Amino acid sequence: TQDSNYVRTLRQIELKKLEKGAKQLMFKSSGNHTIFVDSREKMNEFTPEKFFNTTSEMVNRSENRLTKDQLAKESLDKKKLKKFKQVKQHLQRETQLKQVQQRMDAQRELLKKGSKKKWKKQRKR
Amino acid sequence: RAVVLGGDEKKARSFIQKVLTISKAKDSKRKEQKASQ
């Protein structure tokens, strides 16, 4: 019941909407970390607490590992589950709208004037 | 005809269906009372 133009525009709403939705979302870092030191005696005595000057709790939190010197809701987080899945639903819709446009697209080329033995080769004049 | 609507359109599109149903029931009942008379 819907044409190529109507479906195309909708997907363009959700691609931009998805782009904005992802931007507001934060995302915990997964990169890998290394520390370079001088000597092997300095190796064996190394510990994350000393080098970062933080407590054990804050070592795990790499995003905001405040120095220890600096240190001296189910509904709320449920709505966060709503926010993240909200972006997911747009993601699902975008691929769903993509499929129909592809199917709408394909039928138009089948309707297109051609040889179509699979297209036989005939330099369109 | 198949369409996708935003939240603002949807929350509205319920209401006109709501109002129309109330009017029909209001109209039908008034017809019945006069018909009984």
């Binding site: 639903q89 819709r93 769903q96 | 005809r1 198949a2 369409v3 996708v4 609507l5 949807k10 599109r13 006109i16 269906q17």
Partner: peptide, 11 residues
């Protein structure tokens, strides 16, 4: 026309 319309992909 809203009767003629039909809603899909609801969220």
């Amino acid at each position: 026309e809203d009767e003629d319309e039909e809603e899909v992909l609801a969220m």
